[PDB]
């Protein structure tokens, strides 16, 4: 489970790069979430396409065996929910 | 109104997550050590409902489970310290729901020296 | 079609508006209320009428009901319907049910916290015959006596599919109408106190609301209640009762009878509904009932000529016999502080014209009835009534509505209902009585009934004095015999004053309120006469009517019989007749009995007291034989808990032979016997051969009512002899007549008491009863002499008084004085659930004959909880509670729904807590299943024999093991082998092997089955009946199994099987085919596929092309390629998922992996998630604790899992937390509905 380009910055509203490759296949058990400088950790795409909660609805894609303005400053890491033992992911970095 | 928390020290090298707002037993909760620099790893799910733990190879020797069901809280006890790093989190017992991962944990200092 | 209903002081009777509760500040009672909602904060308002009686209860065929109680009192309270079917969860009652505790909440509810939900099934609900609604009523079941006693009965009403129907809201009314007696002495609060007979809870007319609207109907859901017998005779002053179909004068109640009975009103203006039995204490039985408006040939004329009148009447106009020692003397003797036999008493006499200065013709037999009164509907009776007496009297019938004066319609003074009003003596008063329809019978019911009038200045001591006569009201020698039951009691008659004077030899001593000159004038007496003075003489198949009346003093209710006849009742022979106090009933008979015969009361103490009279008639395609004994028994009325005395009893029992020594021992299907006679079933038009002997101490008799001797000896009239002295031995020979048997409109097979008659009342108490079956046309046949089609059980409902069954002397056993541990309320002889043999199958219909014998208490009240039965005589009404009076011996058919444990109680509250109670077991024919004993579940160590040979040890006869010695084997001839299930159990098979031992075959050939409940109370399976004892065939070989099967399936714990003939050496492999007590056992479908693919559904399932693992297919043993299903991905998050449509009780799970290829896959670990709804869980916690259930070891071996306490749930998650290899399942669900 890595991350490409793992590093790729932008700013606010147009089209950068974050996307996760898996070692396998996962089928469907991938996620994407967000990190605060801080330690405020959230979530946001989870089960592929699928829309969140107390999280807007811009953010999304998925397909074998692959997938993916306001505070842009975080480090995305991909979730990988298909067997034990579980992983997170590489990285990709961002500053503005 | 799902929270997580966790207790806000350190220690020389070489010694020995409360929720409110749900069910506390009928959800897996997993521990996380986040090395610096690095990314988010993984430890093990801890079933505070009975007990059924699936722990990672890495922390396979540091990574004990216990937990206590009238208090709502769940611990993680480790021995023998390396010279540290920054970082729990919820899943569901059942697939389908959407209670995985939902909340983060509240982040612990950690450090491993003697100053 | 789901009605909701959410059910939940004091009070002085009198004073209504104390129901505000809801709402005005100006005994301890508990009693149902109602509410608004589900959040059990709000009252509703309650009608006036209602007063203490529960929410009344509406619903209908297919509907559900769903109440939800809670408790809000000092004590606990359940909620125990009537007349419906529910599931356990909802009886309300606590008894060895042997039931989850999950399912006992039920049983007791404590403050606070139950709904109950019933189900009302098509066979619960009326037929066309019955009333449009039946009326049936719910209670606490807690403490039966307290429950009632305290406020705690509501109305339950059941109508056919049709409620929804526009009724014309000016009509309908119908209020129910509780009769409940409370004992405020002897309810939940307490420390006598005394004993209230109210009307919905009110006494002394206090009931408001009660108004009905005039040229309308108005329907009446009758519930009588009550903790012990008494019984009520109701009437309403203008009007007339219809029931069933009957044209009805009073209501014949008792405790938990049931009705729904109508009238109708004619006319305006108020009228006192009343109880009328003599007892003043009943007298708060009394409402006002106020009629008013809402919104929107040729007929003859008979002229009767009849004067009250004085005259000397005796009582017995032949001398008795002055021995006084025997009671005889006082009643009718002359000397010293006692008068005799000449009473001075006023009578109605009729004349011939109106000059009344000559009289009409008197006729012995019908001695002291006024002249009969005969009246077609139409006609108009003139009764010209002249006095000649000396206290002013008046004629008056009860009856009739339209009784006015003659020519005039107004009436002389302030006289409210012509009733009160005397006729002065000296004066003539013209009577106007005109018979219109209203008065008369209903096409259904007879062509006559029997009526009566009566002076009613002070009805009291006017009747008393003698003022009686009979009035028939019919429809569109002549009229004759005519019977009047009458206790005279001379304590109260006018002229108790003038007869001490000429019959006493000094007026001086008064003493007035002793208690034997008092109790020696109360003449016991048929028409007039008494200890058999009325003789009446009747030919040989003359076909007579008889015109019956209860008139008199008497309180009690009187069950009256002729002997070895059999009268047409309700279109339908019987041979008791149960008469209410003021009531009247038409019977019809052909003497078809040479003989003399003795008409009397059965009714204990009126009988010995006086109350006989003689009969004397005489004139003017098998052959079923049944060896049958009376033999003597030691009897413990009930072993199980509760300080064990023995009682020596004698019984009926069945023999094979003349030769009176091979006894045709009973099991099974006559287990539940008792006390009672074997079953003597026959058909009609064949011929029924009875050899009796006689042991026992004693004198006894074989008489039934039905033993019909024929015309031999004519010199004269005879007493049948009888009379089987203690060790003769008489035989009775009597062909079967088709009145004996049922009408073309009963049930296949009627139902006839049979016992000794030799002291009537005391030796029933000491044990001689039994069942005379008289079953119909070809029915009942084989070598069996039964009808097999039906399960038929017979249950006599009685109180044994130990104190009077004659071996009481005999019973100095106990060591050197209240007799209420001498008395046990016992149906059959068992007392407190310890009746046994009540096993029946699913779903079968039963035939129950039930019977009451004795004293006047045992006006038992009879329900089955849960069921409900059907009773027949001309017409079918359902019902759900039968109110059994002595001498009678009803026969009902009811079909057992829902499987368990089930009750029979009599809902006399009293008799209940004293025992009167038993269960039955309704198991599924369709759970059959391994016990365990091939699977191991049974553990080695309960199999046990008696001898081994050697190393052929017991714990190796199971089923299909192998190798070289792989069984038990024993070289003794008598042998056994013993298997202890650890539990009562259920079997309903059993299959049997036997080795090979190098090159023999060793097997039983010819085996018999022992069982026992405790350890060493083996009894012998003779299943079937076939003879002495079931002789079974084993085996051929080695290989074969032999499944013979338990068809009156074994209820035991420790089961012991005796070889009898074997092939060189009894050898034994063996499995037990059962199914635990409540029947949860069984597949709910995978291997049957009875769980159609798509309500099997999982996470995901993995596919490429070739395999295609989806749940469908995960189905325990099916073959083949790709048998199983795979998730998609291996994860411990990962659930399977069944939709079983309903709610279900899961009682655990089998489970298996799968073989492909060669890499094994199987699951070590899972865990159950479950759920009502599909979109909300819950793991089945334990002890604190989610469980974690063990897995398979290999990915062939299925193994059992029971779920303990089991869950219920209709949704069903299994969630596989550790594996091995792969992730791969094939599984049962054990359980039930
Ligand atoms: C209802 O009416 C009863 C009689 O009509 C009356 O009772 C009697 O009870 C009292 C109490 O022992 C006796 O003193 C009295 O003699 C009785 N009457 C008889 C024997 O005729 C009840 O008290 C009345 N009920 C109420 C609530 O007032
Ligand atoms: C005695 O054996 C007979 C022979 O099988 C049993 O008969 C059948 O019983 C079933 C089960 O209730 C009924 O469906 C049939 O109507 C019976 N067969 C016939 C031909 O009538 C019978 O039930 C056994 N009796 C007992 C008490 O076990
Ligand atoms: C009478 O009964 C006794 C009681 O057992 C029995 O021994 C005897 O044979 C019977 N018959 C006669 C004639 O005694
Ligand atoms: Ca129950
Ligand atoms: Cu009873
Ligand atoms: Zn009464």
Redesign the interface.
Same mark, same amino acid.
């Given at each position: 489970m890595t991350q490409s380009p793992s590093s790729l910055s932008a700013s606010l509203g147009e089209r950068v790069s974050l996307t996760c490759r898996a070692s396998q296949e996962i089928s469907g058990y991938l996620s994407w979430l967000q990190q605060k400088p801080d330690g405020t950790i959230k979530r946001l795409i989870y089960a592929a396409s699928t829309l969140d909660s107390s999280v807007p609805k811009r953010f999304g894609s998925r397909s074998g065996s692959d997938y993916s303005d306001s505070e842009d400053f975080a480090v995305y890491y991909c979730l990988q929910y298909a067997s034990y033992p579980y992983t997170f992911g590489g990285g990709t970095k961002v500053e503005i | 109104q799902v929270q997580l928390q966790q207790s806000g020290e350190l220690m020389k090298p070489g010694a020995s997550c409360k929720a409110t707002g749900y069910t506390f #037993?009928?959800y =897996?909760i997993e521990w996380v050590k986040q090395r610096p620099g690095?990314? +988010? @790893? =993984?430890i093990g @799910?801890i +079933?505070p !409902?009975? !007990?059924?733990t699936?722990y990672?190879?890495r922390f396979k020797g540091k990574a004990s489970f216990t937990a206590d069901?009238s208090s709502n809280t769940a611990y993680m006890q480790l021995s023998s310290l390396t010279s540290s790093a920054? %970082?729990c *989190?919820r *899943? #569901? %017992? %059942? $697939? !389908?729901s #959407?209670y &995985? $991962? &939902?909340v =983060? !944990?509240?982040?612990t200092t950690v450090t491993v020296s003697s100053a | 079609a789901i009605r909701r209903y959410y059910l939940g002081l004091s009070w002085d009777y009198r004073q209504s508006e104390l129901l505000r509760e809801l709402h005005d500040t100006r005994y301890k009672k508990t009693v149902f209320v109602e509410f608004t909602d589900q959040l059990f904060s709000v009252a509703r308002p309650r009608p006036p009428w209602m007063g203490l009686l529960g929410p009344t209860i509406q619903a209908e065929v297919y509907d559900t009901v769903v109440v939800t109680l809670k408790n809000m009192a000092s004590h606990p309270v359940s909620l125990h319907a009537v007349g419906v079917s529910f599931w356990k969860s909802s009886e309300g009652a606590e008894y060895e049910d042997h039931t989850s505790q999950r399912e006992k909440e039920d049983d007791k509810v404590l403050p606070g916290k139950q709904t109950y939900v019933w189900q009302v099934l098509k066979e619960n609900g009326p037929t066309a015959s019955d009333p449009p609604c039946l009326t049936y009523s719910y209670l606490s079941h807690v403490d039966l006596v307290k429950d009632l006693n305290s406020g705690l009965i509501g109305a339950l009403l059941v109508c056919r599919e049709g409620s929804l129907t526009r009724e014309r809201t000016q009509n309908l009314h119908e209020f129910v109408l509780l009769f409940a007696v409370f004992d405020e002495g002897k309810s939940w609060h307490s420390a006598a106190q005394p004993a209230m007979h109210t009307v919905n809870g009110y006494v002394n007319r206090s009931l408001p609301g009660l108004i009905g609207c005039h040229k309308k109907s108005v329907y009446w859901h009758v519930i009588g209640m009550g903790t012990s017998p008494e019984v009520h005779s109701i009437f309403l002053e203008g009007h007339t009762f219809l029931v069933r179909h009957h044209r009805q004068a009073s209501l014949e109640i008792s405790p938990l009878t049931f009705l729904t009975a109508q009238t109708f009103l004619m006319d305006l203006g108020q009228f006192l509904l009343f109880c009328h039995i003599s007892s003043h204490h009943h007298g708060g039985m009394e409402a006002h009932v106020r009629v008013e408006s809402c919104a929107e040939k040729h007929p003859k004329t008979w002229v009767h000529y009849i004067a009250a009148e004085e005259e000397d009447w005796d009582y017995a106009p032949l001398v008795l016999a002055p021995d006084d020692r025997s009671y005889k003397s006082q009643y009718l003797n002359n000397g010293p502080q006692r008068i005799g036999r000449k009473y001075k008493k006023v009578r109605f006499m009729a004349y011939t014209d109106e000059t009344f200065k000559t009289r009409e013709a008197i006729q012995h037999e019908s001695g002291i009835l006024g002249p009969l009164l005969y009246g077609e509907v139409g006609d108009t009776l003139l009764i010209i009534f002249k006095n000649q007496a000396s206290r002013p009297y008046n004629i008056y019938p009860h009856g009739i509505t339209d009784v006015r004066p003659l020519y005039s319609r107004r009436l002389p003074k302030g006289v409210k209902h012509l009733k009160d009003f005397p006729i002065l003596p000296g004066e003539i008063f013209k009577y106007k009585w005109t018979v219109t329809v209203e008065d008369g019978p209903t096409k259904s019911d007879p062509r006559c009934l029997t009526r009566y009038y009566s002076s009613f200045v002070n009805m009291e001591r006017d009747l008393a004095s003698g003022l009686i006569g009979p009035l028939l009201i019919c429809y569109k020698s002549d009229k004759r015999n005519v019977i009047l039951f009458s206790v005279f009691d001379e304590n109260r008659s006018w002229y108790l004053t003038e007869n001490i004077q000429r019959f006493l030899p000094n007026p001086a001593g008064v003493q007035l309120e002793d208690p034997e000159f008092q109790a020696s004038n109360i003449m016991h007496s048929i028409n007039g006469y008494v200890f058999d003075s009325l003789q009446l003489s009747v030919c040989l198949h003359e076909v007579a009517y008889w015109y019956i009346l209860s008139i008199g003093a008497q309180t009690d209710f009187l069950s009256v019989f002729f002997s070895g006849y059999t009268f047409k009742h309700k279109m339908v022979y019987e041979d008791t007749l149960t008469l209410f106090p003021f009531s009247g009933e038409t019977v019809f008979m052909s003497m078809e009995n040479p003989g003399l015969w003795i008409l009397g009361c059965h009714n204990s103490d009126f009988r010995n007291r006086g109350m006989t009279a003689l009969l004397k008639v005489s004139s003017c395609k098998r052959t079923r034989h049944y060896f049958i004994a009376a033999v003597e028994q030691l009897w413990d009325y009930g072993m199980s808990e509760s300080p064990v005395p023995r009682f020596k009893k004698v019984v009926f029992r069945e023999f094979a032979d003349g030769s009176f020594t091979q006894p045709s021992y009973r099991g099974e299907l006559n287990k539940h016997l008792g006390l009672l006679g074997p079953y003597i079933r026959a058909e009609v038009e064949d011929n029924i051969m009875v050899t009796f002997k006689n042991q026992a101490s004693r004198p006894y008799s074989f008489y039934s009512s039905l033993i019909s001797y024929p015309d031999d000896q004519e010199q004269g009239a005879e007493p049948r002899h009888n009379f089987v002295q203690p060790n003769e031995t008489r035989t009775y020979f009597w062909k079967v007549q088709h009145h004996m048997a049922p009408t073309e409109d009963e049930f296949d097979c009627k139902a006839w008491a049979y016992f000794s008659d030799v002291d009537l009342e005391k030796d029933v108490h000491s044990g001689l009863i039994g069942p005379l079956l008289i079953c119909r046309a070809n029915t009942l046949n084989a070598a069996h002499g039964r009808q097999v089609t039906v399960q038929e059980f017979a249950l006599f409902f009685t109180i044994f008084d130990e104190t009077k069954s004659w071996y009481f002397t005999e019973n100095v056993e106990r060591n050197c004085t209240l007799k209420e541990n001498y008395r046990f309320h016992a149906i059959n002889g068992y007392v407190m659930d310890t009746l046994p043999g009540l096993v029946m199958a699913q779903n079968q219909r039963i035939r129950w004959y039930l019977l009451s014998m004795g004293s006047n208490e045992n006006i038992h009240s009879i329900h089955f909880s849960g069921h409900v039965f059907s009773v027949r005589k001309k017409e079918e009404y359902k019902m759900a509670v039968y109110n059994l009076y002595p001498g009678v011996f009803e026969t009902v058919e009811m079909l057992p729904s829902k499987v368990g444990i089930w009750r029979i109680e009599c809902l006399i509250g009293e008799h209940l807590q004293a025992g009167m109670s038993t269960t039955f077991l309704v198991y599924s024919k369709k759970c059959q299943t391994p016990l365990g004993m091939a699977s191991g579940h049974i553990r080695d160590f309960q199999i046990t024999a008696s001898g081994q040979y050697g190393q052929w040890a017991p714990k190796l006869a199971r089923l299909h093991y192998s190798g070289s010695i792989n069984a038990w084997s024993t070289k003794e001839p008598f042998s056994w082998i013993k298997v202890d299930l650890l539990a009562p159990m259920i079997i309903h098979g059993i299959k049997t092997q036997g080795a090979r031992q190098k090159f023999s075959s060793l097997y039983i050939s010819q085996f018999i089955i022992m069982y026992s409940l405790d350890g060493k109370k083996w009894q012998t399976y003779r299943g079937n009946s076939t003879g002495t004892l079931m002789v079974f065939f084993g085996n051929v070989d080695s290989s074969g199994i032999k499944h013979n099967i338990f068809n009156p399936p074994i209820i035991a714990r420790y089961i012991r099987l005796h070889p009898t003939h074997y092939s060189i050496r009894s050898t034994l492999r063996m499995e037990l085919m059962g199914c635990d007590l409540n029947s949860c056992s069984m597949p709910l479908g995978m291997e049957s596929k009875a769980i159609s693919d798509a309500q099997i559904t999982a996470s995901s399932y993995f596919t490429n092309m070739f395999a295609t693992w989806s749940p469908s297919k995960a189905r325990l043993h099916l073959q083949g390629r790709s048998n199983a299903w795979r998730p998609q991905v291996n994860n411990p998050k990962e659930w399977l998922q069944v939709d079983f449509q309903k709610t279900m009780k899961v009682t655990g799970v089998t489970t298996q992996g799968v073989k492909s290829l060669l890499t094994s896959m199987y699951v070590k670990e899972f865990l159950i998630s479950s759920s009502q709804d599909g979109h909300q869980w819950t793991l089945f916690f334990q002890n604190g604790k989610v469980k974690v259930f063990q897995g398979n070891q290999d990915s062939f071996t299925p193994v059992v899992n029971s779920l303990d306490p089991p869950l219920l749930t209709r949704y069903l998650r299994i969630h596989p937390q550790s594996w091995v290899h792969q992730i791969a399942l094939r599984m049962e669900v054990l359980g039930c509905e």
């Open positions: - | #037993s009928s =897996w690095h990314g +988010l @790893e =993984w @799910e +079933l !409902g009975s !007990g059924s699936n990672n190879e069901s920054v %970082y *989190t *899943t #569901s %017992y %059942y $697939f !389908g #959407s &995985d $991962f &939902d =983060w !944990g509240a982040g | -």
